[PDB]
């Protein structure tokens, strides 16, 4: 579920997803259009694509299970569809953490639709 995604971001990236990634660039936030603007934005682009390929369950409301071992987030459970949702969130959390070096809210927060033309929308 989205609440779990927020939890993974805080656990892995040690940042609030709501405060730092809810309206950044063209893809960080609900939906998206245009080109991913930077590393962080592409992390979100990939996450949107990941959710878009999940079939059989709901990435927004379904709850998945995970544990922490060998210094990582391990997605588990007996439901393969829910594990897939967890993997999407896990990958995005790690991506945000690994690209904090270039995070730039001053340039990319509330970027604007004009800057994210539908004609430049990169396909998954």
Curated annotation (Swiss-Prot):
Binds 1 Ca(2+) ion. This is Acidic phospholipase A2. Disulfide bonds join 26-116, 28-44, 43-95, 49-124, 50-88, 57-81, 75-86. Ca(2+) binds at residues 27, 29, 31, 48. One of its GO terms (molecular function) is toxin activity. The active site is at residues 47, 89. The keyword Membrane does not apply. Expressed by the venom gland. Its main location: secreted. It holds the Pfam family Phospholip_A2_1. GO terms for cellular component: extracellular region. Signal peptide: none annotated. GO terms for biological process: arachidonate secretion; lipid catabolic process; negative regulation of T cell proliferation; phospholipid metabolic process. The keyword Glycosyltransferase does not apply. It catalyses: a 1,2-diacyl-sn-glycero-3-phosphocholine + H2O = a 1-acyl-sn-glycero-3-phosphocholine + a fatty acid + H(+). Belongs to the phospholipase A2 family. Group II subfamily. D49 sub-subfamily.
């Amino acid at each position: 579920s989205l609440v779990q995604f927020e939890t993974l971001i805080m656990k892995v990236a040690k940042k609030s997803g709501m405060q730092w990634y809810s309206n950044y660039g063209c893809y960080c936030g609900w939906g998206g259009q245009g080109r991913p603007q930077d590393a962080t934005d592409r992390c979100c682009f990939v996450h949107d694509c990941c959710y878009g390929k999940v079939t059989g369950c709901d990435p927004k409301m379904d709850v998945y299970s995970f544990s922490e071992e060998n210094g990582d987030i391990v997605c588990g459970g007996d439901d393969p569809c829910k594990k897939e949702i967890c993997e999407c969130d896990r990958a995005a959390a790690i991506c945000f953490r690994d690209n904090l070096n270039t995070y730039n809210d001053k340039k990319y927060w509330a970027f604007g639709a004009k800057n994210c033309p539908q004609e430049e929308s990169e396909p998954c």
